[PDB]
Design a protein around this ligand. Structure first.
Ligand code: FMN
Ligand code: FMN
Ligand code: 2HC
Ligand code: 2HC
Lengths: 217, 217
């Protein structure tokens, strides 16, 4: 099988973890760097990735399921790490300035092309909320990073569970300082599936027929 | 360098294509199948991928830049193919029926459980607009597929240009029947970069410091 297809056919949504297997620090660093290298509109990188690693953090994450979506709760303590994909509520020129400043330092642009580069910012101004939030534009960038992460995990042979069945308001209450100026609509548990009880590990994958999703003109 | 990091460090946004080089049909098939295998909430696959391949299609795509974002226009005819990432305006039971029916054909689920698998649908109405639309929930799924596509292209060593600088209104008029019931906010040109005029091919990549985007708890 072609290496790419094999990876994408063999990755799946784990439904039960093995609590005695953890992701190595070597593999965790590759995944975090892969997330950092993700592409985004105007290189805005309107995101933050919060890694829930310690037992104390796992407890706090475990507690965010007190009100809803408890079918996802068992995974928190059983899995290796949980990653929260946070997107910024509003993106300002000061936020973009952090990007352009780093670009000047990295030698992509000099101050000359810089002030001119600040113009790329109009593409942000164009996208917003009636109230003033760019979150309708930043959330999709975070999902792109997530798509990148899932492909990365398939290459590292690490199991995972994407979770939209989380409590955003409670997460912002529990991770108050960390999610300041951000929101979190999706999380990702990673680890190693349970050898016997993960029932999804042996169910065939199912997608719509090629002709139903792809059109060639 | 670690294979995964090498791929993500070496992929970039092409700013000029070589008109004489096309993507082979063998590579195109791997990419399309990779897009089809993308994960989505409840396996909804609320998307459609439109491949602009023919000269006639390229002309139509070229014409959608008549009003805005003409900086992206030159790539249309110069690159190999353009892929439109379309997300469904509203998601219904009839839509889910298609997924569930294919699941039974794939043998993932037995005919008897189709009806009980519809239970996962409550998560969709939980994202129903006042207008009865779900596009705020479907658009992010499309971006996940896009993140998957970018990683896939880095593995195949094919150049690309993600484009949000497109005209969704004009695209809907030009690809009237193809985008019916969908919207398109992002497109992706693929091909081979121009050996001498693609200025971005030799500029270093720049991302925020690890500590600015990743927090470990
Ligand atoms: C954005 C998103 C959110 C999802 N949320 C959940 C979740 O809350 N819990 C879980 O069990 N599965 C979740 N999944 C898993 C999907 O059911 C799964 O990706 C889809 O069925 C395709 O199967 P595979 O992932 O096994 O290919 C979600 C997937 C996506 C991409
Ligand atoms: C969602 C999205 C839309 C983008 N739109 C454009 C676009 O319209 N035109 C273009 O030249 N670049 C576009 N880009 C490219 C970004 O500028 C680029 O991905 C970012 O600067 C990071 O650089 P790399 O892609 O070279 O790593 C877009 C990127 C993303 C992910
Ligand atoms: O990333 C860039 O160079 C342009 C991005 C962009 C342009 C126009 C409209 C929307 C965009 O994300
Ligand atoms: O994909 C699944 O099995 C559940 C997805 C989900 C659940 C609750 C809320 C939002 C969701 O996408």
């Amino acid at each position: 099988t072609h290496p790419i297809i094999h990876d994408l056919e063999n990755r799946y949504t784990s439904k039960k973890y093995d609590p005695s297997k953890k992701v190595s620090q070597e593999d965790l660093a590759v995944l975090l760097e892969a997330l950092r290298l993700s592409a985004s509109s105007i290189n805005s990188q309107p995101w933050k990735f919060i890694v829930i690693e310690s037992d104390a953090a796992k407890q706090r994450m475990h507690d965010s399921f007190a009100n809803m979506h408890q079918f996802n709760q068992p995974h928190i303590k059983a899995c290796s790490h949980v990653i929260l994909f946070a997107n910024k509520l509003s993106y300002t020129r000061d936020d973009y300035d952090v990007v352009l400043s780093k670009a000047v330092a990295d030698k992509r642009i000099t101050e000359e092309q810089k002030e001119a580069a600040f113009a790329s910012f109009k593409f942000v101004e164009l996208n917003c909320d009636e109230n003033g939030e760019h979150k309708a534009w930043t959330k999709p960038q975070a999902y792109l990073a997530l798509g990148n992460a899932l492909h990365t995990l398939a290459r590292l042979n690490i199991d995972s569970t994407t979770m939209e069945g989380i409590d955003p308001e409670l997460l912002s209450e529990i991770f108050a300082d960390e999610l300041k100026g951000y929101e979190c609509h999706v999380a990702l548990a990673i680890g190693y599936h349970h050898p016997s009880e993960d029932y999804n590990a042996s169910l065939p994958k199912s997608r719509k027929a090629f002709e139903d999703v792809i059109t060639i003109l």
